Amino acid sequence: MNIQAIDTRHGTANQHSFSNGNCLPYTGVPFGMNFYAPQTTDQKGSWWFHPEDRTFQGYRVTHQPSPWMGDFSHLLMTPVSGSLSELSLFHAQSSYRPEESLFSPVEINLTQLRYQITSQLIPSMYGGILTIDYQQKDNHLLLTLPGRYQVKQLDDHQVAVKVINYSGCEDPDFSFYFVLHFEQPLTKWFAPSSGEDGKILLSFGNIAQQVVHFSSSFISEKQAQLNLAREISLRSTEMLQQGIADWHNYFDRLKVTHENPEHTKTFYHTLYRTFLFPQTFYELDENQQPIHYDTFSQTVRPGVLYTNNGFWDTYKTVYPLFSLIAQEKYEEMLEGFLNSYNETGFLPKWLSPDERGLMPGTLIDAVIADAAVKKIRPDLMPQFLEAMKKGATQQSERENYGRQGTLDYLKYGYVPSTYHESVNHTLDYAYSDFCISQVAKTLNDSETATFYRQQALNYQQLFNPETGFMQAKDTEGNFRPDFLDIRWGKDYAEGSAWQSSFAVYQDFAGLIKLYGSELAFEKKLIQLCNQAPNFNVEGYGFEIHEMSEMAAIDFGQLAISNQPSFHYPFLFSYIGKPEMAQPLLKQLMQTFDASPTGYPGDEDNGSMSAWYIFNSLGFYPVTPGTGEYVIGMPLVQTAEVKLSNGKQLTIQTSPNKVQQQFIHEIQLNQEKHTAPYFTHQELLNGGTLDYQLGIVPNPQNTAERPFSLSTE
Ligand SMILES: [Ca+2]
Ligand SMILES: [K+]
Numbered sequence: 001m002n003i004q005a006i007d008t009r010h011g012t013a014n015q016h017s018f019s020n021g022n023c024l025p026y027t028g029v030p031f032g033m034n035f036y037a038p039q040t041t042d043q044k045g046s047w048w049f050h051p052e053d054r055t056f057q058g059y060r061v062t063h064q065p066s067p068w069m070g071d072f073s074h075l076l077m078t079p080v081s082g083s084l085s086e087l088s089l090f091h092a093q094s095s096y097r098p099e100e101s102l103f104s105p106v107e108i109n110l111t112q113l114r115y116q117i118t119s120q121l122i123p124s125m126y127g128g129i130l131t132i133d134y135q136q137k138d139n140h141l142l143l144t145l146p147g148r149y150q151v152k153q154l155d156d157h158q159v160a161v162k163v164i165n166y167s168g169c170e171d172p173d174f175s176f177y178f179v180l181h182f183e184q185p186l187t188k189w190f191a192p193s194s195g196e197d198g199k200i201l202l203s204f205g206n207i208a209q210q211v212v213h214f215s216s217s218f219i220s221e222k223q224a225q226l227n228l229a230r231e232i233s234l235r236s237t238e239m240l241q242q243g244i245a246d247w248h249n250y251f252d253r254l255k256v257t258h259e260n261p262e263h264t265k266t267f268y269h270t271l272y273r274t275f276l277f278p279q280t281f282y283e284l285d286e287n288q289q290p291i292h293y294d295t296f297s298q299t300v301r302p303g304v305l306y307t308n309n310g311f312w313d314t315y316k317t318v319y320p321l322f323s324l325i326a327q328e329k330y331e332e333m334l335e336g337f338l339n340s341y342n343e344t345g346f347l348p349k350w351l352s353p354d355e356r357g358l359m360p361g362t363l364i365d366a367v368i369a370d371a372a373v374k375k376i377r378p379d380l381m382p383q384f385l386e387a388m389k390k391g392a393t394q395q396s397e398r399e400n401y402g403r404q405g406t407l408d409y410l411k412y413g414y415v416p417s418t419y420h421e422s423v424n425h426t427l428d429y430a431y432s433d434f435c436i437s438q439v440a441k442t443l444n445d446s447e448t449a450t451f452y453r454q455q456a457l458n459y460q461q462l463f464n465p466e467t468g469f470m471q472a473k474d475t476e477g478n479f480r481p482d483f484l485d486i487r488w489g490k491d492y493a494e495g496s497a498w499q500s501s502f503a504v505y506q507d508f509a510g511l512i513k514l515y516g517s518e519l520a521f522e523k524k525l526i527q528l529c530n531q532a533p534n535f536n537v538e539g540y541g542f543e544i545h546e547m548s549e550m551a552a553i554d555f556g557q558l559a560i561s562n563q564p565s566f567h568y569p570f571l572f573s574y575i576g577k578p579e580m581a582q583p584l585l586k587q588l589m590q591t592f593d594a595s596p597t598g599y600p601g602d603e604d605n606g607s608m609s610a611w612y613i614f615n616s617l618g619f620y621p622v623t624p625g626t627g628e629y630v631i632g633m634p635l636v637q638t639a640e641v642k643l644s645n646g647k648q649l650t651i652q653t654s655p656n657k658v659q660q661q662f663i664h665e666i667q668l669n670q671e672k673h674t675a676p677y678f679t680h681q682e683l684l685n686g687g688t689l690d691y692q693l694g695i696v697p698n699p700q701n702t703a704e705r706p707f708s709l710s711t712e
């Protein structure tokens with residue numbers, strides 16, 4: 001699909017109480033350092049855009065990855081004509097018509113009805129161009145500068161701004177520089193000033209059109225001017241063409257068709273949202289070398305850095321996808337993450353712009369392990385192993401970094417029930433341990449490998465044979481009494497025991513053994529899927545959106561609206577019965593579309609989009625760190641995959657209509673494939689993957705299973 005046909009309002013109809021993606025309409029280039037979105041309201045906190053709002057407050061320069069994290073280093077540009085009562089966003093707002101506007105990744109175009117202004121914003125990596133067509137005779141641009149700001153006029157065509165605003169940051173004076181060059185000169189000059197929450201009305205007189213070239217920096221005003229200088233001569237049309245070419249660079253790597261063109265539309269909307277995050281967080285100095293801002297020591301340093309990523313979300317799907325089709329990006333991102341470690345002492349958990357510390361676990365370990373076993377950045381692996389071992393053995397004194405309860409985990413073999421969400425912490429630590437072991441193995445560090453492989457079995461500590469669930473345990477080794485399977489919160493993050501008890505990616509065969517047999521585990525999975533989506537709120541004391549999103553649909557406890565349940569259909573592969581979940585997977589894929597309500601829950605920076613992409617192709621990374629993709633059920637009819645190693649995988653399916661709900665047979669390069677997973681190595685060979693599909697199952701009864709520690 002052409003990038004210009006993507007509508008960025010996809011996934012944008014949301015509120016605090018209910019998510020259909022919690023996406024913003026981000027205009028930007030792939031991994032752009034800034035994104036751009038219309039703001040429709042300032043009265044709803046982080047929910048500052050809604051596609052049904054008919055009010056326009058301004059173009060917002062944003063770094064907001066999610067409404068839960070908030071923004072950093074934002075400002076707004078609002079074209080205005082005539083004179084203003086006061087300069088607040090409310091006093092300057094205009095209505096506009098959503099249905100007459102353009103919202104695409106490479107272009108916003110809209111008319112402010114109050115002022116008779118049509119404007120067009122085209123992005124670039126570090127800046128963009130705003131063209132403003134005025135019908136009236138006294139024409140301006142209002143800059144809204146939240147937080148502490150400075151502004152000065154460099155000359156009659158140029159204004160430099162600095163703003164300090166964020167939701168959380170290690171640098172209390174975290175600065176963003178923004179420079180605007182105007183084709184038509186300012187007709188009122190101003191002196192340097194600074195303050196808080198600035199509103200600066202720039203005047204241009206009676207011109208018919210203004211063209212604003214803008215750029216930005218986290219380094220300095222001078223770096224912002226250098227960023228600008230490198231594109232100051234582009235016309236808007238040329239910048240648009242480059243932006244389209246930038247997106248096509250990624251889109252061309254996955255050319256797919258479907259029986260139903262609505263599915264193709266959905267695919268490409270999710271693909272747009274797969275190449276946004278993590279955002280570029282470095283610039284190119286005068287010698288074209290990477291530099292970035294280090295918020296921890298408050299200094300400019302050489303090297304790459306990336307931001308806006310919670311690994312708890314993104315390790316599941318985003319990086320494994322990059323491992324196939326965007327390895328050059330993966331390579332540079334890993335370098336950035338190592339720089340984060342060098343600068344702060346711990347591998348990052350949630351960058352926005354720096355360590356925010358949210359969510360259980362250190363799932364960056366899975367991003368690293370997956371890269372290691374796939375031979376991505378083998379040169380960095382010795383340093384990563386040291387960083388991971390530090391995270392597993394030292395308690396940070398700063399509460400946002402590393403594992404919480406590191407020492408208790410080592411003392412007891414689990415995080416005890418005195419900690420919040422101790423089940424998630426324990427299971428995440430045990431999986432991390434596995435990831436450390438894998439990195440060690442790739443480096444032939446046998447002693448490390450052995451120790452961490454053993455640690456990775458710590459999930460067994462929280463398994464209660466009485467209930468068949470993971471439960472929190474006190475320091476004397478007793479399970480909390482009064483357990484209820486559907487009770488959310490307290491011991492579990494954003495779920496009940498049903499959404500938390502299967503986070504054992506490293507060792508499903510071992511988890512199965514705790515239930516007693518494959519059959520006992522099968523019965524648990526059937527019960528998970530085939531019950532009503534009941535929930536109890538006692539761990540929170542009220543209903544949260546994740547509960548509502550599960551209860552909005554009839555898919556049992558399989559809460560596809562949130563990351564913990566993403567792998568659930570694949571659990572049937574671990575008992576050799578993937579045919580049981582093939583219809584399920586096709587059904588789950590129908591909960592996604594390209595509309596404002598198009599996702600089942602929070603999209604989370606590529607996380608849910610990449611779930612959709614993998615499942616569309618028919619395979620899924622259940623265990624980052626093994627180099628395997630467990631086979632599911634494809635939605636495409638054809639796909640050409642441009643792999644990073646220069647080869648091509650062609651996927652072809654027999655007719656793939658609504659009634660096709662099973663895999664009949666798979667041939668990889670003309671050889672019958674019966675294993676319930678592919679290896680990364682197999683797929684990287686390229687060639688042809690043919691799925692013959694069925695209207696009834698064709699059980700293979702394979703003795704093969706995807707990777708588990710206890711059977712390797
Ligand atoms: Ca989520
Ligand atoms: K939805």
